[PDB]
Design a binder for these strands. Structure first.
Ligand SMILES: [Mg+2]
Ligand SMILES: [Mg+2]
Ligand SMILES: [Mg+2]
Ligand SMILES: [Zn+2]
Ligand SMILES: [Zn+2]
Ligand SMILES: [Zn+2]
Lengths: 166, 165, 110, 246, 166, 110, 447, 246
DNA sequence: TGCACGGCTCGGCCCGG
DNA sequence: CCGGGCCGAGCCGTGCTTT
């Protein structure tokens, strides 16, 4: 099989909170707070904010938030579309990500309640996302991969490497 | 179409023996036995010499990186091109570790000496190995002095024999 | 160059090495060779189905594949006898008594 | 073929484990007199000899003398499954398999393949030992454990009516002194002033495993090897040869 | 045939430069990234030939290198082989000089190795480190696969490449 | 294991019926995979018809050539079609130059 | 084909008789003269991975403490303060800091340093308009410097002066001699190579024995008394891959035997001082105590040969000679733009100014893990000899003469590849009294 | 020059081990009445006070006063080398070496180098303490061990004839309640209700290694650091002050 | 062609004082 | 019963070179 240089089961950044093995579960169980760069999405109706694609309160799709690198002003995707992805008050091109704070305990508990998979010992993530969007992966997929003993690749697929013969 | 037929398409050994040998000395010994059995290989002078031209680069290239190496902290990942003169990481409390250890230079020295003493190699390679050993034991002259005596000496070595001859 | 642990099976164009046969088997032809399993066994199983090797004449590199229709090695036993090991089971049986491999076998090349 | 049974298999396991701390491959010389062993460590720094006469064997039958060579690690791993209240039985047939049996509340049989090792004869003449000191195991073990804190070399000084051991580090100092008036020494016989030094790793490796109620005698001199003995089951004996420092 | 990712990865950028040192005339340059080393000799040589044809059809002049450029490129090739990889091909210095003298485009790129060169501050060059992609292209493309390249030239009816045929 | 993970994903995360329903490796026969060389950006669809007891991937010579491979030492990848369809995304691709290699940005059907 | 100068014989010219001169000399420095105590571990069971780090740190400590004492000699330097206790100084005070140059960048305003000492790291800025900004522009790291200026509570230490250990401007002239004495310098003989030109060396050996052409040369030859060789006396074995085809004598024992046979032809009144180099059988990293005795015995067996170390200082008639090989020049050439191998005098003067023979660690020079730094020039000499660059040069700097003796190996394939031009068979002659080069011989006609 | 003799070195070593888990270097002031030490946490979060009057020691002879600066690790190792019934003697002569001599079956001697350490004399007089409770060391040890599982914060609550300590987490919750009818709460003097919170790491560090038969005294108040003190040998005592969190 | 080798830390289990 | 000694996973770094 194909595994990254440190093995990874979900494409979710944890930083230094998880330790050497980037264990999301160990950081969550100790109540640590991690500071990393991710993409935050915001629900248009009520106003939930966090690294998720669906709002738990109402189950409606959120919108990516654009941040100003100089003044940290947040705009929804619809608003930034008119602004040509440039800050009007400032003058700098926006970015979809910023360095933020996350509490792994709430996210992991929500995921476990979502997929009804409670008995998992380890769950490895990444130190930092390498993309330009820094969009994370759902944690439910990581939980199911950990449960079924499979590993992820740089684009989200599971691959097997073998020699070829005719 | 095809020319030759086969009874079974997956008949024969399935795993290479190279993946079941642990030590380097064991690998070299098994490979030399295999070369000795086959009539048309002529191990005794070309196999061992061409093999020695694979461990010699490792030896010489690891002694030249010990004298110009960068140090690093165990907790941090900070790399210092020269060691901190207080003995500890300036930005934390951890201790400093080498990036090229002393045992990385002389991991292939025993197999190289066996290859030199057992088989027929030109005197160039034999002298290179003897001088490499002498140079390895001379760089640490005043950091690791030989303060330990011994009961029995002369284990049929080759370097001392070459020197006394 | 020879790496430690990777044997050399024949000197350049030396009689007693691999015998050249022109042809293509069921599972060879693109860039792969055809090898009898008996000579896979009688080299201490360093060769296995799919193991690469650096060749001399046609190109540089190939993958080995079993072909039982061609000849195998001729070996000299410990008591002085000579045998033609063209069979897989015979190679398994007589492996421990081998003293010298007189001939190494064939190699089908397209 | 032979049959050997021993009482208190835990003591035999401890002895084999102590032997295993320095050497890896060794062969046993079983004869009509008993069984004996001798080997040298790969670094050629320590030499261990040990014999077990028939006196300490409850039952012992043999057709003569034979050499048996087994892997030490596997032997001690098997021996460590025993208990202090079980009997150990060693048996071998014409086949090259060493059958080991432990008889307690049940009977279990272990099969260990044999191996061949070079039985080179290594021996040395009786060197001139000017000083001899007999002390308990506990005192020397404690002295070694204190010495290990500060340095890696331990120094001996033997004087008439005064035997002392020292271990000095870079800035810290450790010293142990005793006399025959004290309770830690049995007897001392020195012919002149003696000074020597030996490493801490080897000393800790060999001294470890000695009971408190053991009489250990040490023979050493000036810049010359050291010899240590302790009696086993009141009939046997063990030797340790250690090369000096500097 | 649109399979290997040379057009997507190897060609980092295409820019137009002026011969301020000789005539202030314009020409075309190609920037090769790291991934071009995995494309293959045929892909690299075909990229060079396509660049030549596009420069011809854009009505642009020829790259006119100074001698210092030739010295810098020879030193780059030698040092790259000495300190990085075997290159599976050894161009003699005469071949390198001939290739530089007879290529109508500038084959350059970013730095891919942490080694400095001697001939620094060359005009038209914005780096002083090894350009692994460009030199690997020059070594394992037009030089290692000149037979297939001249075959393609003959099939393609392209003039100006007679030096390679010779 | 990959098929079990896909079935769990479909049943739990998305609320759809299972697809593979396999208990032994012989229950994957007739299902489709994707072959991908480590230096290309397009894949090709293949079908499983059997299993062998060797450490090689046997396939037609046209299958290996359509991935620009030579079959003398090369190694490629196979992944289940549905896994790649559900999981692959272009927003997880690194932003350096060598980030679009090994990615199935398009697949060939014939 | 195994000629090794077996039967080379050169006899003294009876037409000329040497004059009588008292042989007053002594070796003032040798690496196998300082007893370096090995360092002990911080606990009872330390291992290999910490003793090496401790030894390197102790070496750097010794370097800093040795080069800090030299700086505080000229009265112009005063009010030295500890770097650690810089937060407790007023903004109107003038202080000096002494430490190691970690790094040196360049900005539009000037240069920024990372000076470090025993008690912490401090940043330093030097304005572009400073009078000494030119000197500090071409200093390479790991050297010991002094900075003078005003400290700020906001970090940066603004400075207006820059100091090197340097050489004093004033010195007292030594008393003269009763008669003149001459000495000769040679380096990089490279015995056993194909590009080594033996005929030129035989002509030179003939020249030393009275085979002269002019009256003044005859007078000099009758007066010569000493001879110093500065490394690379044999081509060595296994220096680079593919050297076997480049060797005429592919045996290190035979290389040293042939070299010993060649040098035996000099008159018995000439005393050799031989030092090892980077191609001999000697220590992989500098300083090198001596040759490997079991490999270089024939040159030890010479009756008039005295084997010295690298670096070593020799005193002849009260004149100090700092004899070194010169592996440290390559770092100076690489780091400071505007210098080339063809002119090694300027890099040598820079090394003398810094008072260290190989400042930077981790570059092109291998530095051994010693507890004491023996490469610092403690005492200022009268003459300095070097080699390793195969190019002749000579300069004078504040009273001391800096000489770079040439090679005897003709240009090889590699030196052609890297565009290096050797100047073989050039030999400088030095007068003992003034410690200055007075004549340069030339035997390049044969080579 | 002073000579101080102590009996039962194990208790001394245990006390030193508890005192050495907060600061690495501390200074001891030897004076006729006794030895007193007041260290400071490196992060400035917990206070530790030492007081060892001369009444405990069997022999106590000293003239004048002197400070003794030593690093905790070496002294802790030397003391932990002491066995159950080893007499502990502390002696300092004219030299700059702090001698630790141990007496028993053998005379084992250790030496340490004194280190100059700055002294920060900050005396804290009596503070307004809302409530004071004395409980057995077993109860607090067990409660801290139980609360370490759920979270990193302990909440202390004291009321009229009621002592309650609670820890809360994301999902789990632990609470321990005590009152006069239990064997742990010896008595409780409280003028008014109070509540405060403290860290679990520091609490475990201070509370670890406390004997079961110890009348540990706890005093604390609303949003105010807790004071803890227990007696040693009926004459000596140790005092802990831990700053609160948030 | 890149993998193969050394070293440091950090818990989970015995096993013993 | 409570405290060490020890293994077994993991995670980092490194592999000829003339002046
Ligand atoms: Mg291929
Ligand atoms: Mg030279
Ligand atoms: Mg040299
Ligand atoms: Zn919502
Ligand atoms: Zn802004
Ligand atoms: Zn650090």
């Amino acid at each position: 099989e194909r595994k990254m240089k440190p093995p990874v089961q979900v494409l979710f950044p944890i930083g230094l909170a998880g330790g050497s093995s980037r264990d999301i579960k160990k950081a969550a169980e100790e109540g640590k707070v991690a500071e990393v760069e991710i993409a935050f999405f915001k629900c248009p109706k009520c106003g939930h904010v966090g690294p998720e694609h669906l709002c738990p309160n109402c189950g409606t799709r959120k919108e990516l938030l654009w941040v100003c690198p100089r003044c940290n002003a947040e705009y929804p995707e619809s608003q930034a579309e008119g602004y040509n992805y440039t800050c009007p008050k400032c003058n700098v091109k926006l970015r979809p990500y910023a360095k933020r704070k996350i509490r792994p305990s709430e996210l992991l508990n929500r995921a476990m309640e979502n997929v009804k998979v409670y008995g998992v010992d380890k769950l490895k993530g990444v130190m930092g996302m390498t993309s330009g969007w820094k969009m994370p992966e759902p944690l439910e997929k990581g939980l199911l991969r950990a449960k079924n003993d499979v590993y992820v690749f740089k684009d989200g697929t599971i691959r097997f490497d073998a020699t070829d013969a005719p | 179409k095809f020319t030759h037929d086969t009874d079974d398409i997956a008949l024969g050994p399935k795993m290479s023996l190279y993946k079941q040998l642990g030590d380097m000395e064991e690998k070299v010994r098994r490979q030399l036995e295999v070369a000795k059995r086959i009539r048309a290989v002529d191990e005794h002078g070309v196999a061992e010499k061409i093999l020695n031209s694979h461990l010699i680069p490792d030896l010489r290239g690891n002694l030249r990186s010990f004298t110009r190496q960068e140090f690093r902290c165990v907790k941090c990942n900070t790399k210092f091109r020269r060691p901190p003169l207080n003995g500890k990481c300036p930005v934390c409390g951890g201790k400093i570790v080498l990036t090229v250890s002393k045992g990385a230079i002389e991991k292939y020295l025993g197999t190289a000496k066996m290859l030199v003493t057992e088989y027929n190699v030109k005197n160039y390679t034999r002298q290179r190995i003897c001088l490499t050993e002498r140079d390895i034991d001379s760089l640490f002259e005043n950091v690791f002095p030989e303060t330990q005596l011994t009961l029995i000496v002369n284990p049929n070595d080759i370097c001392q024999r070459l020197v006394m001859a | 160059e020879v790496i430690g642990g990777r044997p050399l099976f024949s000197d350049p164009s030396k009689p007693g090495g691999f015998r050249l046969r022109y042809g293509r088997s069921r599972a060879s032809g693109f860039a792969t060779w055809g090898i009898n399993p008996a000579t896979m066994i009688l080299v201490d199983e360093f060769l296995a189905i799919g193991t690469q090797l650096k060749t001399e004449r046609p190109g540089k590199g190939a993958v080995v594949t079993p072909v039982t229709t061609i000849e195998g090695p001729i070996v000299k036993l410990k008591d002085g006898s000579v045998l033609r090991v063209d069979d897989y089971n015979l190679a398994l049986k007589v492996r421990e008594d081998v003293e010298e491999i007189l001939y190494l076998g064939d190699a089908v090349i397209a | 073929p032979f049959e050997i049974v021993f009482e208190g298999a835990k003591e035999f396991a401890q002895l084999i484990e102590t032997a295993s701390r320095l050497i890896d491959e060794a062969a046993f010389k079983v004869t009509e007199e008993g069984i004996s062993m001798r080997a040298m460590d790969p670094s050629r720094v320590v030499l261990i000899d040990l014999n077990l006469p028939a006196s300490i064997f409850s039952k012992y039958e043999v057709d003569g003398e034979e050499t048996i060579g087994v892997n030490m690690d596997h032997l001690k791993k098997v021996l460590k499954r025993g208990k202090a209240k079980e009997t150990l039985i060693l048996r071998k047939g014409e086949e090259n398999f060493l059958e080991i049996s432990l008889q307690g509340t049940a009977t279990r049989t272990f099969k260990l393949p044999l191996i061949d090792v070079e039985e080179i004869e290594v021996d040395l003449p009786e060197l001139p030992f000017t000083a001899k000191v007999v002390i308990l195991g506990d005192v020397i073990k404690e002295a070694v454990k204190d010495a290990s804190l500060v340095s890696d070399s331990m120094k001996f000084i033997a004087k008439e009516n005064e035997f002392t051991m020292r271990a000095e580090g870079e800035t810290q100092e450790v010293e142990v002194k005793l006399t025959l008036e004290d309770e830690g020494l049995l007897d001392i016989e020195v012919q002149e002033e003696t000074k020597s030094a030996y490493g801490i790793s080897y000393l800790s490796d060999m001294v470890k495993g000695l009971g408190k109620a053991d009489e250990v005698t040490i023979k050493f001199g000036n810049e010359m090897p050291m010899q240590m003995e302790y009696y086993i089951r009141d009939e046997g004996r063990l030797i340790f040869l250690l090369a000096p420092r500097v | 045939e649109g399979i290997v990712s040379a057009p997507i990865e190897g060609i980092a950028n295409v820019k137009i430069k002026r011969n301020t040192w000789a005539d202030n005339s314009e020409y075309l340059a190609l920037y090769y990234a790291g991934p071009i080393r995995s494309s293959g000799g045929t892909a690299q040589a075909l990229s060079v030939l396509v660049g030549d044809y596009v420069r011809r059809k854009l009505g642009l002049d020829r790259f006119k290198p100074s001698e210092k450029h030739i010295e810098r490129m020879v030193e780059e090739v030698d040092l790259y082989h000495r300190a990085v990889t075997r290159l599976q091909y050894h161009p003699s210095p005469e071949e390198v000089r001939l290739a530089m003298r007879n290529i109508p485009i500038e084959i350059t790129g970013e730095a891919t190795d942490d080694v400095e060169v001697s001939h620094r501050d060359v005009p038209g060059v914005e780096t002083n480190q090894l350009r692994g992609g460009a030199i690997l292209v020059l070594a394992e493309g037009v030089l290692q696969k000149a037979k297939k390249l001249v075959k393609y030239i003959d099939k393609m009816g392209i003039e100006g490449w007679e030096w390679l045929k010779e | 294991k990959v098929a079990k993970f896909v079935d769990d994903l479909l049943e739990k995360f998305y609320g759809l019926p299972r697809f593979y329903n396999a208990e032994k490796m012989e229950d994957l026969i007739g299902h489709l995979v994707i072959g991908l060389a480590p230096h290309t950006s397009a894949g090709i669809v293949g079908r499983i018809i059997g299993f062998v007891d060797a450490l090689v991937g046997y396939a037609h010579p046209y299958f290996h050539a359509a991935k620009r491979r030579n079959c003398d030492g090369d190694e490629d990848a196979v992944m289940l079609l549905l896994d790649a369809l559900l999981n692959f995304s272009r927003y997880y691709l690194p932003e350096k130059r060598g980030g679009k290699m090994d990615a199935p940005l398009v697949i060939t059907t014939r | 084909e195994y000629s090794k100068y077996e039967d080379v014989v050169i006899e003294w010219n009876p037409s000329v008789t040497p004059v009588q001169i008292e042989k007053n000399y002594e070796v003032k420095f040798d690496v196998r003269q300082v007893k370096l105590r090995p360092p002990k571990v911080k606990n009872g069971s330390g291992k290999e991975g910490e003793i090496i780090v401790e030894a390197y740190a102790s070496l750097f400590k010794s370097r800093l403490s040795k080069l800090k004492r030299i700086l505080r000699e000229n009265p112009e330097i005063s009010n030295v303060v500890d770097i650690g206790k810089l937060n407790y100084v007023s903004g109107d005070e003038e202080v000096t800091i002494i430490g190691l140059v970690n790094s040196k960048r360049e900005t539009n305003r000037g240069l920024i340093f990372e000076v470090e000492d025993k008690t912490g790291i401090v940043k330093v800025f030097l304005p572009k308009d400073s009078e000494d900004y030119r000197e500090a522009f071409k200093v390479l790291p790991d050297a010991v410097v002094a900075f003078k200026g005003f400290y700020s509570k906001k970090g940066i230490f603004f400075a207006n002066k820059f100091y090197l250990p340097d050489v004093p401007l004033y010195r007292k002239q030594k008393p003269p001699l009763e008669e003149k004495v001459y000495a000769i310098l040679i380096s990089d003989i490279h015995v056993g190579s194909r590009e080594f030109c033996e005929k030129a060396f035989l002509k030179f050996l003939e020249w030393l024995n009275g085979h002269v052409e002019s009256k003044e040369e005859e007078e000099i030859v009758s007066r010569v008394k000493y001879l110093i060789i500065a490394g690379d006396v044999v081509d060595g074995i296994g220096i680079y891959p593919g050297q076997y085809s480049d060797l005429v004598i592919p045996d290190i024992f035979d290389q040293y035997e042939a070299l010993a046979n060649l040098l035996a032809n000099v008159p018995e009144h000439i005393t050799m001082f031989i030092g090892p180099g980077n191609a001999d059988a000697a220590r992989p990293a500098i300083p090198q105590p001596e040759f490997y005795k079991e490999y270089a015995k024939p040159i030890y067996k010479l009756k008039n040969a005295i084997i010295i170390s690298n670096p070593a200082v020799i005193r002849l008639h009260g004149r100090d000679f700092l004899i070194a090989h010169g592996r440290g020049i390559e770092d100076v050439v690489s780091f400071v733009p505007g210098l080339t191998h063809h002119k090694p005098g300027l890099p040598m003067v820079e090394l003398l100014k810094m008072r260290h023979l190989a400042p930077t660690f981790g570059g092109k020079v291998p530095i051994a893990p010693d507890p004491e730094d023996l490469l610092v020039i403690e005492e200022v000499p009268d003459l300095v000899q070097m080699g390793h660059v195969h190019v002749y040069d000579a300069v004078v700097y504040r009273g001391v003469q800096l000489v770079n003796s040439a090679t005897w190996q003709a240009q090889t394939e590699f030196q052609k590849m890297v565009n290096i031009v050797p100047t073989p068979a050039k030999v400088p002659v030095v007068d003992v009294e003034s410690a200055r080069v007075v004549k340069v011989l030339d035997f390049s006609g044969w080579c």
